[PDB]
Amino acid sequence: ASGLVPRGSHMMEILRGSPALSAFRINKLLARFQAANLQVHNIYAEYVHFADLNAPLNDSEQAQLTRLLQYGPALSSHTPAGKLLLVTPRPGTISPWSSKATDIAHNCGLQQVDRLERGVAYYIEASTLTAEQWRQVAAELHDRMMETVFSSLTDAEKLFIHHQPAPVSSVDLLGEGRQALIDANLRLGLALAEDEIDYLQEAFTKLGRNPNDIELYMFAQANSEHCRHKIFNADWIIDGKPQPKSLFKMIKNTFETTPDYVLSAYKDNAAVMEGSAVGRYFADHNTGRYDFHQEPAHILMKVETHNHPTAISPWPGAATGSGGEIRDEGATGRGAKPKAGLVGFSVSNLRIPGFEQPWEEDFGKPERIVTALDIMTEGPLGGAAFNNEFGRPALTGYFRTYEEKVNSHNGEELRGYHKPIMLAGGIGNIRADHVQKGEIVVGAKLIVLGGPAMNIGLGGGDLDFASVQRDNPEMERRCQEVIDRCWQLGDANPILFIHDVGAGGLSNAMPELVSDGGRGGKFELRDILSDEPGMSPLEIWCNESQERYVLAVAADQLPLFDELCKRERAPYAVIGDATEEQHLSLHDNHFDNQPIDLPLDVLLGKTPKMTRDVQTLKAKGDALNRADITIADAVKRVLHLPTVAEKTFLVTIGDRTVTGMVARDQMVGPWQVPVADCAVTTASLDSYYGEAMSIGERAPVALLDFAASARLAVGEALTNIAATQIGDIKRIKLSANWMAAAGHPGEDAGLYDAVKAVGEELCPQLGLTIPVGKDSMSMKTRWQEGNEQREMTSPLSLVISAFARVEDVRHTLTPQLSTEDNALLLIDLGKGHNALGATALAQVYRQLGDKPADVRDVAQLKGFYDAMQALVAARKLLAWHDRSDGGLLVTLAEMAFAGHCGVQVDIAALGDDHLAALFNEELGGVIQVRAEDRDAVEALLAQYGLADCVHYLGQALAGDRFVITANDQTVFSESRTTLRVWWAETTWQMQRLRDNPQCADQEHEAKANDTDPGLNVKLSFDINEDIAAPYIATGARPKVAVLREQGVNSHVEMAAAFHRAGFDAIDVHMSDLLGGRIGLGNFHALVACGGFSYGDVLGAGEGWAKSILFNHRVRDEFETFFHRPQTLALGVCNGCQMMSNLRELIPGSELWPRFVRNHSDRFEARFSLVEVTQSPSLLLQGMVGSQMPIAVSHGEGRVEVRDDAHLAALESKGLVALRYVDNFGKVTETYPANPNGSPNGITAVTTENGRVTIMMPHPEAVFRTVANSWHPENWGEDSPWMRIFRNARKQLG
Ligand SMILES: Nc1ncnc2c1ncn2[C@@H]1O[C@H](COP(=O)(O)OP(=O)(O)O)[C@@H](O)[C@H]1O
Ligand SMILES: NC(=O)CC[C@H](N)C(=O)O
Ligand SMILES: [Mg+2]
């Protein structure tokens, strides 16, 4: 019975929600209050919803709103008791939750809802607390950067205050002289240099009028280091000598040397290289049918960073890092399609409570930034939240910790990552005729595609609210869909030009766009979509609100554009027109004035180039002090370094299967151990051509040797990618992302030497192009600690990402050792240098050491690569794993973990210094070959000049022994399981602190049981028998409705699975049904696909389902469909959730459960073992008793019943169709074998008639054998799961 009060010209309603925190989270709050000496007896939390209404709700509408706001796990309600503390978003902000919840209310016919918002009501019983202690309690319950605490529910009215538009303000240069600019510079935080103030002074003096604030702000954002790249274009003088090239020209040298296969470099916000001719699969604009289009799928690539914002607010910082990079990809050329991501983090020491490591010292930090631990807790969740909700798989990455007091180039100082590296990148595909940006005709319409804006991130950043970003990935997915429809029109693609909206917001993006066409623009401020009516023109034009693009379309294509956008529900606005005159005009219809009126050459005019006159500093290395070092202690420590240690916390939080094109993800083999050295995707759903991505980075090396650190980043990118079938090294293309503390003594000369080392030397010599890259030049943090200045300065940190077209994805090797008769060979590209400076070993004993690794011999590096390519293509490798952090010791350990076996290796040939042989991080790695091939492989390597680098080590053996000898002496010997568990402790402790500790513990303890047989298969049918073939051979192809709501993302691969089984797959959007363009009476089959419809706001699948239920016409249509006597329907993942919420329309579904937040409280992207159980399901005919793995990617997959009576009834009806099993084959509730905590392992149910089946796993992700993370060697093209789609076809007849 809800509250409803006046709220300005509107009315606010208050709707109580469900309990907000599980028992473990409640207990964690209680323990934190107790650890803080706050005497709190109990705490209870409930969601509370606030609906700001523009008109009243009738009783039917009010019941609908109430039902929309019922979602989530059915935790036990408590009557409110104690003190209320309500936590909400800060006044003046609108949560993403709000944007999505409101969209659902509108799509359910509740136009009276102006806005919905959510808070958490905490009820705290703590009668003995003082006022100051209550403030400490409040501090504990909210994020000061994003949220506010209120003492009354009615205080939420504050979130919905209507503000009138703020006017433009002029800066009085004519009336005050230069002082007006000086004042404005400080007031608005423009950070203009003196010569910039000169430039602006003269420009406005010439125009004879005062600049407006907006014009000054625009200019200031455009001329920032972040936007202008002054350092990378500067002239240099080093140790008194003028240099001949800028940094950027040295990078371009690699393209001048090696243009091969490059289609686009340095003229877009991504590079493009040649791909392969394959079947690009999408729905025809006229028919709606999915069809393969044989044509080149070229490959785009991009990598960038979001370091500053992540130090302040890591979740949105990481999230919008991903988001911005995805926009760069989609805005490549005249439109393109992101396809897989990568992720990188560098932080200071974690100092996990209760798990502190011996090398870690708390050196303090600025009060205003978060800790390394907080970045590694919230930041990966943020990045993953964007990749998941947007729907691209995230398939490779790095994570480095570093924070130490070292004697480096500027003597003893603190070096680290208090300002982190937060890196996001990826690959996409693009059509050949869309690679080149088009011309912009005079009179083109200039559009903003995407989200209504707010005053976010203005200028890129008393709290620093301006550095707190905001992410709405489903908005970006809706925009990508439009982009996709555009490029899918081929020659009729209406996009003439497109670009990301990033730094400077529209103030940078729209001038950029018209200027890149040789045009001007005239714009109308009040045509831009806004969610913040109070904004000034400066705020409108300059804010860095997210999920926006700018594009130019011919006027005659507007009607087509509008159709495309409304079908996807992507907001857009025409905001201006391209002009012949090279002028920028922004008009304001509300204030009847002209906030901007400038010639473009004034606006975009440059001050002089920078000159950097700098000097070399070079650290003298100190030999490693080995006093406290033993080999055994060193192994234990190194395996405890986060950089080295298992990465599961960063991997399984992100989807790795959406698209159905993932051939090689991080997790390897039957034991799913995250050690894959590179990512591999197929180019299409009908090819074994593909793409690969790898990363190399070695920043600690730069504390000793700048150039060596850059050469090793390139080298390690190659050694990570080398056991994938590529061929010519010139196919490999690099992104070079440069992170430095420019100005810090020695770093500038170091930067130049490092750019020279790779751009002018190593890359040209190898034939590697760097066609893309970025720079971030303020990687240092300063603060006052007690009475003293403190500073934490990053090493020069180059990150290389390598990208390549792949000739045959099937031939990729992993670190999974075989125990067939074998040989382990080390390829030591260190040539016995065995350097220990700037290694993991040094780091874990708080040292830097003397001399680091380096590329020792350029010809031998190329030789290693070409040798590996020859071995891959000839199928002579059983496994490969490169040497990087932690040395040969860690390479061998990780191979043994992935093969769940032992090794017996001898290192006597590697030098007398066993510590250095085992722990150097020189380039190279370990190949495993069949024992019978040893001599031939050693001869092949010898051809490439490598004989002296090649060393036979020994063999992999069944069992649990990890043994390193030197002739007669045992150097090191341990249980492989003991090592594997130690290596897992970091991810264990991270999971434990972030997720349900019960789940974290179960996952960790499972690794200690060596008897685990790994994923394994039992098949009740012949996976090669195409039971649909006789039907397909008739040419009669039944339609399937491939149903998608906004935010759904696994529809293309779902279509292709049905297509292979003989269906004509039709793209049916929920907008198609709502608009009359499709009726389900024309179909015999329907599938509800996976994704994040409405970002799962109001419960996964809930908005989708309730939008059906609350439209009587569409509801009737679905009901009619399900009540027909022979129709078939399938719901997968989000579609499973949707159909579970739609069960009142589905006969025989009365016993179905709900699907809710996983027990782990975390998204689970796993390759899990299931068994097919006896049920009516017509889609699982022939498969009962089969056990095989399947892709799982969900956060809300836990079966929830009303009570045991309901579970028992469901079970006794026999409607359960799939169950999770552990690797021993038993039905399980233990995690992560059962990833979500479903009772009795339930993960699929069917109806009484078998005609409708719903399941949480994704059969469409894995119907192709090549897209199964691990599979039996003997499978052909089809996996077991292809049988589901074939059964559907045969059932139809
Ligand atoms: N930030 C991250 N996000 C996702 N995957 C990651 C991340 N860091 C590491 N990985 C994955 O974990 C595995 C081990 O990483 P790492 O040991 O850094 O690789 P390598 O030593 O081969 O360069 C690899 O498959 C890698 O792609
Ligand atoms: N891939 C999917 O369909 C995921 C479903 C939903 N977004 C969840 O996380 O539970
Ligand atoms: Mg590693």
Ligand SMILES: [Mg+2]
């Ligand atoms: Mg590697």
Ligand SMILES: [Mg+2]
């Ligand atoms: Mg690495």
Ligand SMILES: [Mg+2]
């Ligand atoms: Mg066993």
